[PDB]
Design an enzyme around this catalytic site. Structure first.
Site, PDB file in Angstrom:
ATOM      1  N   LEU A  16      16.370  -0.090   6.484  1.00 27.56           N
ATOM      2  CA  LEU A  16      15.136   0.653   6.593  1.00 27.56           C
ATOM      3  C   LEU A  16      14.148  -0.072   7.549  1.00 27.56           C
ATOM      4  CD1 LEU A  16      14.537   1.626   2.880  1.00 27.56           C
ATOM      5  CD2 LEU A  16      14.892   3.262   4.727  1.00 27.56           C
ATOM      6  N   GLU A  18      12.813  -4.441   8.898  1.00 24.13           N
ATOM      7  CA  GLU A  18      12.845  -5.894   8.741  1.00 24.13           C
ATOM      8  C   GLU A  18      11.428  -6.432   8.554  1.00 24.13           C
ATOM      9  OE1 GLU A  18      15.613  -7.606  11.460  1.00 24.13           O
ATOM     10  OE2 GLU A  18      14.697  -9.607  11.350  1.00 24.13           O
ATOM     11  N   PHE A  21       9.998 -11.585   4.922  1.00 21.09           N
ATOM     12  CA  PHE A  21      10.940 -11.624   3.789  1.00 21.09           C
ATOM     13  C   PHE A  21      12.427 -11.595   4.203  1.00 21.09           C
ATOM     14  CE2 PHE A  21       7.777  -8.098   3.731  1.00 21.09           C
ATOM     15  CZ  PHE A  21       8.466  -7.036   4.310  1.00 21.09           C
ATOM     16  N   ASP A 146      -3.716 -10.872  -1.353  1.00 20.26           N
ATOM     17  CA  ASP A 146      -3.327 -10.295  -0.033  1.00 20.26           C
ATOM     18  C   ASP A 146      -3.234  -8.764  -0.070  1.00 20.26           C
ATOM     19  OD1 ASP A 146      -2.725 -10.096   2.726  1.00 20.26           O
ATOM     20  OD2 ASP A 146      -0.669 -10.786   2.530  1.00 20.26           O
ATOM     21  N   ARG A 150      -0.877  -2.814   4.617  1.00 16.43           N
ATOM     22  CA  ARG A 150       0.493  -3.257   4.939  1.00 16.43           C
ATOM     23  C   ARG A 150       1.307  -3.647   3.683  1.00 16.43           C
ATOM     24  NH1 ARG A 150      -2.862  -7.226   6.470  1.00 16.43           N
ATOM     25  NH2 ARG A 150      -2.774  -9.050   5.084  1.00 16.43           N
ATOM     26  N   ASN A 151       0.650  -3.883   2.571  1.00 11.86           N
ATOM     27  CA  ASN A 151       1.347  -4.287   1.357  1.00 11.86           C
ATOM     28  C   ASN A 151       1.320  -3.197   0.317  1.00 11.86           C
ATOM     29  OD1 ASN A 151       1.983  -6.822   2.408  1.00 11.86           O
ATOM     30  ND2 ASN A 151       0.161  -7.777   1.536  1.00 11.86           N
ATOM     31  N   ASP A 164       3.935  -5.302  -2.655  1.00 10.81           N
ATOM     32  CA  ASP A 164       4.236  -6.658  -2.224  1.00 10.81           C
ATOM     33  C   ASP A 164       3.070  -7.537  -2.634  1.00 10.81           C
ATOM     34  OD1 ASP A 164       4.425  -9.006  -0.073  1.00 10.81           O
ATOM     35  OD2 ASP A 164       6.349  -7.928   0.042  1.00 10.81           O
TER      36      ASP A 164
HETATM   37  C1  LIG Z   1       8.083   7.408   9.120  1.00  8.70           C
HETATM   38  N1  LIG Z   1       9.077   6.401   8.736  1.00  8.70           N
HETATM   39  C2  LIG Z   1       9.746   6.777   7.492  1.00  8.70           C
HETATM   40  C3  LIG Z   1      10.823   5.766   7.134  1.00  8.70           C
HETATM   41  N2  LIG Z   1      10.250   4.422   7.046  1.00  8.70           N
HETATM   42  C4  LIG Z   1      10.462   3.545   5.940  1.00  8.70           C
HETATM   43  C5  LIG Z   1      10.613   4.064   4.666  1.00  8.70           C
HETATM   44  C6  LIG Z   1      10.830   3.207   3.593  1.00  8.70           C
HETATM   45  C7  LIG Z   1      10.893   1.820   3.782  1.00  8.70           C
HETATM   46  C8  LIG Z   1      11.120   0.914   2.605  1.00  8.70           C
HETATM   47  O1  LIG Z   1      11.702  -0.174   2.735  1.00  8.70           O
HETATM   48  N3  LIG Z   1      10.622   1.348   1.422  1.00  8.70           N
HETATM   49  C9  LIG Z   1      10.571   0.697   0.202  1.00  8.70           C
HETATM   50  N4  LIG Z   1      10.798   1.388  -0.902  1.00  8.70           N
HETATM   51  N5  LIG Z   1      10.657   0.535  -1.950  1.00  8.70           N
HETATM   52  C10 LIG Z   1      10.292  -0.686  -1.510  1.00  8.70           C
HETATM   53  C11 LIG Z   1       9.997  -1.865  -2.191  1.00  8.70           C
HETATM   54  C12 LIG Z   1       9.631  -2.961  -1.450  1.00  8.70           C
HETATM   55  C13 LIG Z   1       9.585  -2.929  -0.045  1.00  8.70           C
HETATM   56  C14 LIG Z   1       9.102  -4.140   0.724  1.00  8.70           C
HETATM   57  C15 LIG Z   1       7.752  -3.818   1.335  1.00  8.70           C
HETATM   58  C16 LIG Z   1       6.655  -3.625   0.524  1.00  8.70           C
HETATM   59  C17 LIG Z   1       5.455  -3.250   1.083  1.00  8.70           C
HETATM   60  F1  LIG Z   1       4.375  -3.079   0.269  1.00  8.70           F
HETATM   61  C18 LIG Z   1       5.300  -3.029   2.429  1.00  8.70           C
HETATM   62  C19 LIG Z   1       6.412  -3.207   3.206  1.00  8.70           C
HETATM   63  F2  LIG Z   1       6.312  -2.997   4.542  1.00  8.70           F
HETATM   64  C20 LIG Z   1       7.635  -3.571   2.685  1.00  8.70           C
HETATM   65  C21 LIG Z   1       9.850  -1.738   0.622  1.00  8.70           C
HETATM   66  C22 LIG Z   1      10.221  -0.604  -0.111  1.00  8.70           C
HETATM   67  C23 LIG Z   1      10.732   1.290   5.078  1.00  8.70           C
HETATM   68  N6  LIG Z   1      10.807  -0.060   5.284  1.00  8.70           N
HETATM   69  C24 LIG Z   1      10.105  -0.836   6.291  1.00  8.70           C
HETATM   70  C25 LIG Z   1       8.599  -0.616   6.197  1.00  8.70           C
HETATM   71  C26 LIG Z   1       7.885  -1.552   7.128  1.00  8.70           C
HETATM   72  O2  LIG Z   1       8.190  -2.907   6.809  1.00  8.70           O
HETATM   73  C27 LIG Z   1       9.579  -3.174   6.988  1.00  8.70           C
HETATM   74  C28 LIG Z   1      10.446  -2.312   6.105  1.00  8.70           C
HETATM   75  C29 LIG Z   1      10.535   2.162   6.140  1.00  8.70           C
HETATM   76  C30 LIG Z   1       9.480   4.035   8.227  1.00  8.70           C
HETATM   77  C31 LIG Z   1       8.446   5.096   8.567  1.00  8.70           C
END
Ligand SMILES: CN1CCN(c2ccc(C(=O)Nc3n[nH]c4ccc(Cc5cc(F)cc(F)c5)cc34)c(NC3CCOCC3)c2)CC1
Length: 287
Positions: A16, A18, A21, A146, A150-151, A164
């Protein structure tokens, strides 16, 4: 304590995204039958990261609220290590705000279902939900340290959760300032007492919530984007106030300002903030 899960029961679909973490994957967990889940994998997972992993898992197990991403457990067989979570399909709140701001539709295409910038009602609903998560944490005398968009995460239906605890902080992001060595501070979201002397409290979280409001109503802009972090330390510390965002009603701005009183014990309580946002999200439900 921490529910453990068998690697065999976790099938990875695809990455999904990076972060600091490590990678986060969409996956299919089993026995919780057959289920869709987010799996955060550990990049390093050597020593320091191995016991910061311990910490987060213990913490996430501890916390339980409709506005905290639900955690299911971990998987410690072999490597790398995994944490397993419910799936929030719309990702992080910061990217979601920016992509669904005043050029969501004016810049769409194929993979674009139901564009249009986010309206007042939706923004308030995002705000109220982040507040609720925080009401909960304050109630356990818990300090996030924090809080920022973003979190937070967004799921189907504009379900917004805190996701997070800044356990892993991006060394290369302007959102963080390296105080010295390896300690990274999100100074743009922190009040004077936290920047100067690292006093973190429920009252420094309320300040950060104020700033989260600002991110929400600017559609995801970095607070003090004009400034570098050392300049931003000087403003914040000198008492300078972020501007009312264009999209921000005067009443929402007055809430931000209540979160930004200089003396910590004078800041609005998160509970009152939450209520006042909910009232406002109520009163706009039908406009
Ligand atoms: C329009 N697009 C749609 C698809 N997209 C997504 C969708 C879902 C995720 C994802 O990892 N979701 C998480 N679900 N549960 C988590 C728990 C935990 C976590 C960890 C976390 C928690 C948080 F509060 C923020 C974060 F960015 C990542 C994630 C999920 C995802 N992951 C990335 C998001 C940006 O950071 C890198 C991964 C991307 C991008 C935007």
């Amino acid at each position: 304590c921490v529910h453990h899960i068998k690697r065999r029961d976790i099938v990875l679909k695809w990455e999904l995204g990076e972060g600091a973490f490590g990678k986060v994957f969409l996956a299919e967990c089993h026995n919780l039958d057959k289920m869709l889940v987010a799996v955060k994998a550990l990049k390093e997972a050597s020593e320091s990261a191995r016991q910061d992993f311990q910490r987060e898992a213990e913490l996430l197990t501890m916390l339980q609220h409709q506005h905290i991403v639900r955690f299911f457990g971990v998987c410690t067989e072999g490597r790398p290590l995994l944490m397993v979570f419910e799936y929030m399909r719309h990702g992080d709140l910061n990217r979601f705000l920016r992509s669904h701001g005043p050029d969501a539709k004016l810049l769409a295409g194929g993979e674009d279902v139901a564009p249009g910038p986010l309206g007042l009602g939706q923004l308030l609903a995002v705000a109220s939900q982040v507040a609720a998560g925080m009401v909960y944490l304050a109630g356990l005398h818990f300090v996030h340290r924090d809080l920022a968009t973003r979190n937070c995460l967004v799921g189907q239906g504009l379900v917004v959760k805190i996701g997070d605890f800044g356990m892993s902080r991006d060394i290369y992001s302007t959102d963080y300032y390296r105080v010295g060595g390896r300690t990274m501070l999100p100074i743009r979201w922190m009040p004077p007492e936290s920047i100067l002397y690292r006093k973190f409290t429920t009252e420094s979280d309320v300040w950060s919530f104020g700033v989260v409001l600002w991110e929400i109503f600017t559609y995801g802009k970095q607070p003090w984007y004009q400034l570098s972090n050392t300049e931003a330390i000087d403003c914040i510390t000198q008492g300078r106030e972020l501007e009312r965002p264009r999209a921000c009603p005067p009443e929402v701005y007055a809430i931000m300002r209540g979160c930004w009183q200089r003396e910590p014990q004078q800041r609005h309580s998160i509970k009152d903030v939450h209520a006042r946002l909910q009232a406002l999200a109520q009163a706009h439900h039908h406009h």
